[PDB]
Design an enzyme around this catalytic site. Structure first.
Site, PDB file in Angstrom:
ATOM      1  N   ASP A  16     -19.939 -38.082 -18.994  1.00 29.13           N
ATOM      2  CA  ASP A  16     -20.198 -38.833 -20.211  1.00 29.13           C
ATOM      3  C   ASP A  16     -18.980 -39.349 -20.997  1.00 29.13           C
ATOM      4  O   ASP A  16     -18.716 -38.886 -22.102  1.00 29.13           O
ATOM      5  CB  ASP A  16     -21.087 -37.976 -21.121  1.00 29.13           C
ATOM      6  CG  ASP A  16     -21.759 -38.798 -22.202  1.00 29.13           C
ATOM      7  OD1 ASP A  16     -22.421 -38.204 -23.084  1.00 29.13           O
ATOM      8  OD2 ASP A  16     -21.628 -40.050 -22.152  1.00 29.13           O
ATOM      9  N   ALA A  17     -18.251 -40.310 -20.438  1.00 31.03           N
ATOM     10  CA  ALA A  17     -17.069 -40.885 -21.097  1.00 31.03           C
ATOM     11  C   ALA A  17     -16.439 -41.921 -20.186  1.00 31.03           C
ATOM     12  O   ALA A  17     -16.593 -41.861 -18.982  1.00 31.03           O
ATOM     13  CB  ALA A  17     -16.050 -39.821 -21.408  1.00 31.03           C
ATOM     14  N   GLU A  40     -16.524 -56.383  -8.123  1.00 33.33           N
ATOM     15  CA  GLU A  40     -15.485 -57.022  -7.330  1.00 33.33           C
ATOM     16  C   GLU A  40     -15.970 -57.316  -5.922  1.00 33.33           C
ATOM     17  O   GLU A  40     -15.672 -58.370  -5.376  1.00 33.33           O
ATOM     18  CB  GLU A  40     -14.194 -56.151  -7.333  1.00 33.33           C
ATOM     19  CG  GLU A  40     -13.665 -55.990  -8.779  1.00 33.33           C
ATOM     20  CD  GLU A  40     -12.755 -54.774  -9.008  1.00 33.33           C
ATOM     21  OE1 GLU A  40     -12.757 -53.844  -8.170  1.00 33.33           O
ATOM     22  OE2 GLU A  40     -12.047 -54.747 -10.045  1.00 33.33           O
ATOM     23  N   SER A  55     -17.437 -47.639  -6.859  1.00 33.14           N
ATOM     24  CA  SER A  55     -18.417 -47.275  -7.856  1.00 33.14           C
ATOM     25  C   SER A  55     -19.454 -48.385  -7.841  1.00 33.14           C
ATOM     26  O   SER A  55     -19.104 -49.544  -7.615  1.00 33.14           O
ATOM     27  CB  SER A  55     -17.756 -47.100  -9.239  1.00 33.14           C
ATOM     28  OG  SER A  55     -16.990 -48.223  -9.643  1.00 33.14           O
ATOM     29  N   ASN A 106     -14.788 -52.163  -6.766  1.00 29.16           N
ATOM     30  CA  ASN A 106     -15.953 -51.550  -7.340  1.00 29.16           C
ATOM     31  C   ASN A 106     -17.059 -52.555  -6.939  1.00 29.16           C
ATOM     32  O   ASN A 106     -16.777 -53.539  -6.223  1.00 29.16           O
ATOM     33  CB  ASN A 106     -15.789 -51.422  -8.862  1.00 29.16           C
ATOM     34  CG  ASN A 106     -15.612 -52.764  -9.580  1.00 29.16           C
ATOM     35  OD1 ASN A 106     -15.142 -52.806 -10.717  1.00 29.16           O
ATOM     36  ND2 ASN A 106     -15.993 -53.850  -8.937  1.00 29.16           N
ATOM     37  N   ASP A 136      -6.044 -52.978  -4.314  1.00 28.23           N
ATOM     38  CA  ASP A 136      -7.148 -52.733  -5.210  1.00 28.23           C
ATOM     39  C   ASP A 136      -7.314 -54.109  -5.882  1.00 28.23           C
ATOM     40  O   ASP A 136      -6.519 -54.511  -6.732  1.00 28.23           O
ATOM     41  CB  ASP A 136      -6.798 -51.648  -6.209  1.00 28.23           C
ATOM     42  CG  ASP A 136      -8.012 -51.204  -7.044  1.00 28.23           C
ATOM     43  OD1 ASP A 136      -9.112 -51.767  -6.842  1.00 28.23           O
ATOM     44  OD2 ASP A 136      -7.867 -50.299  -7.908  1.00 28.23           O
ATOM     45  N   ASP A 185      -7.145 -46.725 -10.159  1.00 29.88           N
ATOM     46  CA  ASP A 185      -5.787 -46.679  -9.610  1.00 29.88           C
ATOM     47  C   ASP A 185      -5.527 -45.359  -8.872  1.00 29.88           C
ATOM     48  O   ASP A 185      -4.909 -45.354  -7.838  1.00 29.88           O
ATOM     49  CB  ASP A 185      -4.787 -46.824 -10.751  1.00 29.88           C
ATOM     50  CG  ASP A 185      -5.026 -48.078 -11.577  1.00 29.88           C
ATOM     51  OD1 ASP A 185      -5.382 -49.128 -10.988  1.00 29.88           O
ATOM     52  OD2 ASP A 185      -4.840 -48.038 -12.809  1.00 29.88           O
TER      53      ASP A 185
HETATM   54  N1  LIG Z   1     -17.497 -41.783 -16.058  1.00 28.77           N
HETATM   55  C1  LIG Z   1     -17.259 -41.227 -14.879  1.00 28.77           C
HETATM   56  N2  LIG Z   1     -17.939 -40.105 -14.458  1.00 28.77           N
HETATM   57  C2  LIG Z   1     -17.681 -39.544 -13.257  1.00 28.77           C
HETATM   58  N3  LIG Z   1     -16.771 -39.992 -12.386  1.00 28.77           N
HETATM   59  C3  LIG Z   1     -16.100 -41.100 -12.808  1.00 28.77           C
HETATM   60  C4  LIG Z   1     -16.281 -41.780 -14.023  1.00 28.77           C
HETATM   61  N4  LIG Z   1     -15.436 -42.868 -14.135  1.00 28.77           N
HETATM   62  C5  LIG Z   1     -14.781 -42.824 -13.033  1.00 28.77           C
HETATM   63  N5  LIG Z   1     -15.100 -41.783 -12.150  1.00 28.77           N
HETATM   64  C6  LIG Z   1     -14.453 -41.491 -10.791  1.00 28.77           C
HETATM   65  O1  LIG Z   1     -13.478 -42.597 -10.742  1.00 28.77           O
HETATM   66  C7  LIG Z   1     -13.656 -43.248  -9.537  1.00 28.77           C
HETATM   67  C8  LIG Z   1     -13.281 -44.738  -9.462  1.00 28.77           C
HETATM   68  O2  LIG Z   1     -14.060 -45.291 -10.618  1.00 28.77           O
HETATM   69  P1  LIG Z   1     -13.730 -46.327 -11.825  1.00 28.77           P
HETATM   70  O3  LIG Z   1     -15.026 -46.729 -12.338  1.00 28.77           O
HETATM   71  O4  LIG Z   1     -12.795 -45.881 -12.855  1.00 28.77           O
HETATM   72  O5  LIG Z   1     -13.067 -47.540 -11.024  1.00 28.77           O
HETATM   73  P2  LIG Z   1     -13.770 -48.813 -10.351  1.00 28.77           P
HETATM   74  O6  LIG Z   1     -14.357 -49.650 -11.444  1.00 28.77           O
HETATM   75  O7  LIG Z   1     -14.496 -48.392  -9.190  1.00 28.77           O
HETATM   76  O8  LIG Z   1     -12.293 -49.507  -9.851  1.00 28.77           O
HETATM   77  P3  LIG Z   1     -11.153 -50.859 -10.123  1.00 28.77           P
HETATM   78  O9  LIG Z   1     -11.469 -51.485 -11.503  1.00 28.77           O
HETATM   79  O10 LIG Z   1      -9.703 -50.212 -10.260  1.00 28.77           O
HETATM   80  O11 LIG Z   1     -11.312 -51.892  -8.960  1.00 28.77           O
HETATM   81  C9  LIG Z   1     -15.205 -43.009  -9.158  1.00 28.77           C
HETATM   82  O12 LIG Z   1     -15.551 -43.499  -7.912  1.00 28.77           O
HETATM   83  C10 LIG Z   1     -15.280 -41.578  -9.446  1.00 28.77           C
HETATM   84  O13 LIG Z   1     -14.875 -40.698  -8.432  1.00 28.77           O
HETATM   85 MG   LIG Z   2     -15.174 -48.779 -13.159  1.00 26.71          MG
HETATM   86 NA    NA Z   3     -11.854 -49.774  -7.410  1.00 29.60          NA
END
Ligand SMILES: Nc1ncnc2c1ncn2[C@@H]1O[C@H](COP(=O)(O)OP(=O)(O)OP(=O)(O)O)[C@@H](O)[C@H]1O
Ligand SMILES: [Mg+2]
Ligand code: NA
Ligand SMILES: Nc1ncnc2c1ncn2[C@@H]1O[C@H](COP(=O)(O)OP(=O)(O)OP(=O)(O)O)[C@@H](O)[C@H]1O
Ligand SMILES: [Mg+2]
Ligand code: NA
Lengths: 307, 306
Positions: free
Chosen positions: B221-222, B151, B185, B148, B111, B229
Site C-alpha cells: 500500500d504505497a 510501455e 508490472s 511495464n 528499461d 530501476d
Molecule cells: N506498490 C508496490 N507493491 C508491491 N510491489 C511493488 C510495488 N511497486 C513496485 N513493486 C515491485 O517493483 C517492481 C517493478 O515495479 P514498478 O511499478 O515500480 O516499475 P514499472 O512501472 O514496472 O517499471 P519502469 O517505469 O521503470 O519501466 C514490481 O514488479 C514489484 O516487484
Molecule cells: Mg510502475
Molecule cells: Na519496468
C-alpha cells in the site's frame, strides 16, 4: 537508526577516486551516504587521457537549495576532499556552516587536498589561493582532518623533519580547529627500514569524567611498489566510518582503516601484476568491489605504536 | 574474472532512483559497474521540490571519448533507463552500437521508460518524440527489455487485456529484436486476490526454445520510486548468474524487491506514525540496509512456467 553523510567529491565513470572510492565502502558499512559530485570525468587525471565536466559553485548551491526546500539538509557527517576551485570551496564552507547550525552534533571530516611530494620535493596540485581558504575558513570548521605530510606542512607553515616536529605540527592543527588530526602518509624515518611510510594520528576528547585528554599513535606501513590514486579518499572515508564505531579509540579506528587499505592494495597489486611488466593507471584501479569483505570487517594486519 | 557494466541513468543526491538504485546493488553482487549520470538532481521528482542540472548529448560524447582514448570502451553489459531527451537517447544508441562492435558479446539491458498507468488510464512522462526512437533505434539494439504494461502496449501498438494478449505482445517485442522480455508490472488479474500485481517473463534461446513464466506479487500500500530501476539492475545480475534460467533469475529479482520494500514500508510507518500515510521522503528505498537481501535473497515467490 540511520547515520547520514553528505560527501562532496569528484566522480569518474571508470575507476575509484573521490566519491567513487568513498561511497561503496561507506554504504557497505551501513551509512546513508549522499554523494554530491563536484565533477564527472571519464577517469582520473593520472591517465594519458581524460575528458569531463565540472560542477560550479552556482550549481552546487542549487543542488543545496533543492535539499533545503525539502527540509533534507540534516546530516550527521559531511565529507570533502579534492576541491579544485576557491569559489567552490567557499561554497562548501557556507554549506557546512548551515548544516552545523541545523545540527550542532554534525561531524565534518575534511581531507585538505593541496598536493603531495614525490621523491623529496612536494608541489601543489590545486590553485595556491585555496590554501588561505583552507587555513582560515575550512579547517576551523573541521572536526577530523587527514593531511599527508606535505599538506600538514603547508597548513601549519612548518617543515616536518621528525616525529617530534610532526607532533608539534599536529598540535598546531588541533589549535586551528579539529580534534582529530591524522597525517595519512609521510617520509619520516622508520626503524623497520626505508621501504616504510609513516602514519601519525592524534585525537583530543573529553572522557565521561569530563577531562580533556589526547590519544596519539603511529603506524609504520610497508611501501608497495606502485602509485595508487584514490587511496587518500578511501583513507578519509574509512576513518570517518571507524572513528564513528570506535569514538574513543583512535588506535583501533586507525588500525582498521590502515588494515582495510592494506587488504584492498594487496588484492589490487595481485591483479595488476597478473594483467601485465609495469602496470598502467588502469590495471592499478583499486579492486573496490572485490574487497567488500575486508571493508566490512578487516583482519587487523598492522598494530599501531602508542605515542 | 570481471564483468563490467556501463550504466547510464540519473543521479540524485538524496534517495534511490536511477544509478542510485542500480549501482550499490550491482557493486554488492561483484560487478565492475561504471555509472554515467545523465542528470544530477537534489532528489527525485516525486517530491514537492527538486533542483539540479542535466547532462547533454555533447557532454555524454565527451565522457565516452575519454574512455575510448584510454581503450576503456570494452564492456560486458550496458544498462539504460529513464531519459527525457531525444538527442541524448540517440547518442546512447550510437554509443551502444560502438561498444557492440568492440565486443559482440555485449548484453544491452534497456528499461524503456515512457510512462505508467495510474488507476487504469496510462499517461506518458517522457516527450512523445521518444517513442519512435525507442521502437526504431533503441529496442532493436536491446538484448533484455523491462517494460511495464503501459510501455509494452506503447511499444507494440497493442492494448493488453489478458495474460494471452500480453504474451502475444511480448512476442512482437522479441521480433523487434530483444531475446528476453519481462513485463515488470501489469493490472492483469490474479487468482490470489485483488491485492496482486502480475509480472510476466519471456526468453528466446541447436534448438530455438521459448521459456515463459509468470509471478503473482502481493501489492504493498504505497507508491515507490526507483523500484523499476532496481528491477532492471537485479534482473541483469541474476540473468548473468543463472544464464538460461529465466525462472530463477526472476524469482531472485522479485524476492530481492520484496525484502527491500518490506524493510522500506516498515520504517516508513515507524517514522509516519500509526494512521499517517508516509511521505516520499519516508518511502525512499532502504537500499543500504538491504545488503544481505541483495547478496542472497530468500526466495519468497515461485514463478509459474507458462
Ligand atoms: N506498490 C508496490 N507493491 C508491491 N510491489 C511493488 C510495488 N511497486 C513496485 N513493486 C515491485 O517493483 C517492481 C517493478 O515495479 P514498478 O511499478 O515500480 O516499475 P514499472 O512501472 O514496472 O517499471 P519502469 O517505469 O521503470 O519501466 C514490481 O514488479 C514489484 O516487484
Ligand atoms: Mg510502475
Ligand atoms: Na519496468
Ligand atoms: N605505495 C603505497 N604502498 C603502501 N601503502 C600505500 C601506498 N600508497 C598509498 N598507501 C596507503 O594509502 C594511505 C594514504 O596514502 P596516499 O599517499 O594515497 O594519500 P595521502 O597523500 O596521504 O593523501 P591526500 O593527498 O588525499 O590528503 C597510506 O597511508 C597507506 O595506508
Ligand atoms: Mg600521497
Ligand atoms: Na591524506
Amino acid at each position: 537508526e540511520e547515520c547520514r553523510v553528505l560527501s562532496i567529491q569528484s566522480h569518474v565513470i571508470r575507476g575509484y577516486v573521490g566519491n567513487r572510492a568513498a561511497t561503496f565502502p561507506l554504504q557497505v558499512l551501513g551509512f546513508e551516504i549522499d554523494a554530491v559530485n563536484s565533477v564527472q570525468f571519464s577517469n582520473h587525471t593520472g591517465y594519458a587521457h581524460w575528458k569531463g565536466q565540472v560542477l560550479n559553485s552556482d550549481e552546487l548551491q542549487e543542488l543545496y537549495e533543492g535539499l533545503r526546500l525539502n527540509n533534507m539538509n540534516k546530516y550527521d557527517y559531511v565529507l570533502t576532499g579534492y576541491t579544485r576551485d576557491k569559489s567552490f570551496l567557499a561554497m562548501v564552507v557556507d554549506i557546512v556552516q548551515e548544516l552545523k547550525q541545523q545540527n550542532p552534533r554534525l561531524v565534518y571530516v575534511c581531507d585538505p587536498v593541496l598536493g603531495d611530494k614525490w621523491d623529496g620535493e612536494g608541489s601543489m596540485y590545486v590553485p595556491e589561493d585555496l590554501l588561505p581558504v583552507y587555513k582560515e575558513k575550512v579547517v576551523p570548521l573541521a572536526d577530523i582532518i587527514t593531511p599527508n605530510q606535505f599538506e600538514a606542512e603547508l597548513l601549519s607553515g612548518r617543515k616536518i623533519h621528525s616525529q617530534e616536529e610532526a607532533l608539534r605540527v599536529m598540535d598546531m592543527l588541533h589549535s586551528m580547529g579539529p580534534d582529530t588530526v591524522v597525517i595519512t602518509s609521510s617520509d619520516l624515518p622508520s626503524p623497520q627500514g626505508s621501504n616504510y611510510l609513516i602514519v601519525l594520528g592524534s585525537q583530543r576528547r573529553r572522557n565521561p569524567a569530563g577531562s580533556v585528554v589526547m590519544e596519539r599513535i603511529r603506524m609504520d606501513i610497508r611501501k608497495v611498489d606502485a602509485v595508487f590514486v584514490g587511496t587518500g579518499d578511501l583513507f578519509a572515508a574509512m576513518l570517518l566510518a571507524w572513528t564513528h564505531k570506535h569514538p574513543n579509540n583512535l588506535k583501533v579506528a586507525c588500525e582498521k582503516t590502515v588494515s582495510t587499505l592494506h587488504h584492498v592494495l594487496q588484492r589490487t597489486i595481485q591483479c595488476a601484476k597478473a594483467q601485465a611488466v609495469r602496470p598502467s593507471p588502469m590495471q592499478l584501479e583499486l579492486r573496490m568491489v572485490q574487497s567488500k569483505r575486508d571493508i566490512e570487517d578487516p583482519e587487523i594486519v598492522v598494530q599501531a605504536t602508542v605515542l
